[PDB]
Design a protein around this ligand. Sequence first.
Ligand SMILES: c1ccc2[nH]ccc2c1
Ligand SMILES: c1ccc2[nH]ccc2c1
Lengths: 328, 346, 334
Amino acid sequence: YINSKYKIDLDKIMTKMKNKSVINIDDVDDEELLAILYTSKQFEKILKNNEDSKYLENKVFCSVFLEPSTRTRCSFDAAILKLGSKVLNITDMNSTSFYKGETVEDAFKILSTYVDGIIYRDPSKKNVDIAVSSSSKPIINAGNGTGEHPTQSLLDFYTIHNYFPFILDRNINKKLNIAFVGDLKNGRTVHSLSKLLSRYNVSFNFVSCKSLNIPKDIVNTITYNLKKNNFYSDDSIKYFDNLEEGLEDVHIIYMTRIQKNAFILSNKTLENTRDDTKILHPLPRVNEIKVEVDSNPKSVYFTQAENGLYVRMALLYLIFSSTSHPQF
Amino acid sequence: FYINSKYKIDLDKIMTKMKNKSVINIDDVDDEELLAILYTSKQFEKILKNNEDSKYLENKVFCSVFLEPSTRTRCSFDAAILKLGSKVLNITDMNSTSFYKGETVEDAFKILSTYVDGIIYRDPSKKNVDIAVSSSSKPIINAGNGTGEHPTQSLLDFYTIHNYFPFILDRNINKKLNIAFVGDLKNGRTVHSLSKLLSRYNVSFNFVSCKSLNIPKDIVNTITYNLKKNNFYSDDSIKYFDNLEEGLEDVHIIYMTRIQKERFTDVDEYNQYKNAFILSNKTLENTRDDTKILHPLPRVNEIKVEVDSNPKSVYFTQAENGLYVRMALLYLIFSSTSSAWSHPQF
Amino acid sequence: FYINSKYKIDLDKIMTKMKNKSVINIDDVDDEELLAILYTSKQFEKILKNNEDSKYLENKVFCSVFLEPSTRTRCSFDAAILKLGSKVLNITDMNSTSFYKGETVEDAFKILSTYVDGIIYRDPSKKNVDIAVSSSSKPIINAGNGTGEHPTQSLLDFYTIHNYFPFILDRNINKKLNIAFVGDLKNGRTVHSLSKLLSRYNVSFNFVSCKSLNIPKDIVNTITYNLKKNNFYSDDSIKYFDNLEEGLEDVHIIYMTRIQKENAFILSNKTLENTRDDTKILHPLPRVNEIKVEVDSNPKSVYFTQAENGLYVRMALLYLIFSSTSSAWSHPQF
Ligand SMILES: c1ccc2[nH]ccc2c1
Ligand SMILES: c1ccc2[nH]ccc2c1
């Protein structure tokens, strides 16, 4: 089990991940990331070649979504169902009409006795943590108000590593530069990816108008993790207030949503990007990326969304299997 | 493979043709495709009635996007998918705007089509279903929109009719089927699409309505065209009535429509029309001995309960056939290949 | 093949009898059927706890019609169906009127019964579950209505009790089980139906309530009838109390109810020091102030195991009713 260079004791790493909850991307270590990336690529190739995907029958899940994120929900449902497992949905509900003045602790104590794991999206910070304390069953965070969204990080990374697989090598001469563009203060999808990318030899360009620039403690977290693998320099973290400067010599352009312009991506603004550059976006977009760009071989935002299926399949498989693995 | 015993069906050939077809308008189904759907539906009817294995399509995952509440139609498809042994993820209790949370439709179906093998889609917007079909990398099946396009309701209406009067397929100048459409024919869009399909065969229509709610000129023109194409048009093809005793005379099929209060100017106007086209055992004594009564449902006062006892009433068997027809359609479209053996048989 | 420790069960015979039974009132379960449900639930408990194959009923499709939110009860059934390896289509977040959008109930169950193999149905309407049972061509299982019928809650309440005190089945005049019902017994409809069932056995009730919210007269009459039928009625069969210290004395089971004001009957480790050694505490949940959190640590508390057994009992019931598989062999046996 190799991804060109690195062997993976997928047996060993699963024994370690068995019945792991995944709340923060920080819950995934080096070996676990390699296992998720290897297993996601198996599921990508199996699905694309119309082969049997049912690597996890015998499980019943609960998909508790206490805010409407229809894209994220449906992704997990598809992941579960394509694996050949069954799922029980709670949806169109909010925090208060679901926990009809029942304690959270009590609800996850009971619900964990019904199902084999729970996928949980809640705006409440505190609640996902309370569930993780009370649940007798693994929880996988599909997002909360703490901007924790490990699946979105994992799938953002999977996308990036598919076009620039030297990111895993942590080689001082093979460095990847990324430009984060838009509302970096509130685009919590940026903070999480940053946390993860800084574990590798990466150079960040935060492209924002001042008012919505990347928060101080993300930059501290990035700097910590760059310093830990001896990849921090004066040139690790750069800042720009316009594209022409920011999009120069960057392997990845990750566009964010920008609510309340200089940060609209066009085929114009993409002329002076590298030849190999790939454009990411968690979606939904609005005006952030002009439709003309979809024609551009540089755009991958829809393949990114697609990889979400293969990454959530991987993660569910590695965690919930009672192991034969997927291959070729 | 044989339907009626007259018509052979290369269910292999016809599947290779239908594989990954979207079905949006009944006009998307041709002659061979109709025969395939009608044959396959009758297999699934007999298999389910005899408590035999129905899992003819196990490895698929669908999305059931219903952006208006149609619980009968939705549940039918869910059952269809699940009885075939496939799985489904539902989006429901949602509307156009809270589903596409200011996301473009194009973007949403582009992404969702990467997750599932096909999409069942109900939306009032006509614009939208068409946009999904353009953007989706996967077959779409329309479960209904504001243009009154509802191919599954047409297909199941037809399947019901052909079960009592199977000579409709024969297009024989001497074996002609007469149907009465009754009630709000202006707004009963379930009438417009069945008419479009029936006129492809040797059929004689009786539109039974009161001035304000008569069948629209469009349908009449479409019917006339299609009757002229197979040389079955006469001055007695299309007849009109403003009362039942004239209209229900010498008709093989009585298709009753919904008459919603919400379509008058008051509730005077309403009960005058509701009550004048209410079907009773009285109003059914002048119908042929073989006549069958259809209704897409829900009924309300359209058909009096006493009529359910009447061997003439089949509206509930019609609703039931919806299961067998949607199983057929999903099987023919989403199967990965055909083999001689793997087709349903009884 | 099939014992409850001491009682044999012709699970073949009993299934041919239960096949395509609707279960609307706990009265729809008789003696042999209860033994079958108790046996089959304990198989599913052991199979699930040991991570073994639970798919004893593939091939079926159900409809889960929930016309009020009971998310705990709904999710329980969904899990029951899915763990058996069958499939379900859900209708939910709906109410009586927006589901039957001026469609007759009769018409709707007539049609929907042609789509699925059975229907799980929760409706506040008294009238409606009965109307569905008349119209449906397919078994119905009541997940609750305004008449306080909830057979699955009774069955699972009983399964919990029989797991700690299995002598309740023996109907032995010397081995009698005493239970305390505590709180709003007027409106705790979960009390009325369990009482109806327990009184079929050698049981002694302590109804612990204020004035306004005491157990209603016809439950007392129903209990007395069923105790008299098996010669277990005495002046000390049914006792009443105003407070816990008196009521919780010498009782095998404390079943706490919700007491919704819209103080005096709160269970603490303090109020539990004068209970028997072997006492088990039940509650249908959600709790609120009824049971203080400190009690969860107490080996006496089983309200969470009760909720859990809901899964094993609904699996049992669905299996016994919807199986078409004859053979003595194909039943669960561990
Ligand atoms: C799946 C994918 C994209 C989507 N956008 C809105 C709903 C939805 C579901
Ligand atoms: C399942 C389990 C516990 C619960 N508490 C509130 C809703 C709900 C669902």
